[PDB]
């Protein structure tokens, strides 16, 4: 249902804090589950003659996951020396998406554009990418459909690198 990257993304979103160090994050039970699962994939992918310890594979998996997120601009490295991540970009992106989706539904809009540059300017996040915004909206839309089945029947997201196109289909009750 969701990629390993987005599972870690959801864990970060739920943490009741604005920042977290690499070491504190790696100690979270939920994080270890995701990491262990990815590590087993990395073990299978090792080339012939290559056999690293599982622990080594887990640390490599964890680094790959965090780097994928930082790379999409979903979270930032607020401090390199202490390896502390800034979680505000992620939480602000989710707030932005939730509000956008909310207003679109209230106006019964079936198709609307979300321009990447607008999101970058609005939240002062130059590093956010379209793939990052897509995953944030997918998660919010998934939650919206679950919480408001009388309003949101179905949804789709199309690509327009300049932005995304949200498609919303409404349920009978809302009309």
Swiss-Prot record:
Has a role in telomere length regulation and telomere end protection. Acts as an inhibitor of telomerase loading through its interaction with CDC13. The C-terminal wHLH region seems to mediate telomere-specific function. Residues 85-175 are annotated as: Winged helix-turn-helix (wHTH) 2. Residues 1-86 are annotated as: Winged helix-turn-helix (wHTH) 1. It is found in: Chromosome, Telomere. This is Protein STN1. It comes from Saccharomyces cerevisiae (strain ATCC 204508 / S288c). The lineage of its organism: Eukaryota, Fungi, Dikarya, Ascomycota, Saccharomycotina. Interacts with CDC13 and TEN1. The chain holds residues 312 to 494 of 494 of the full protein.
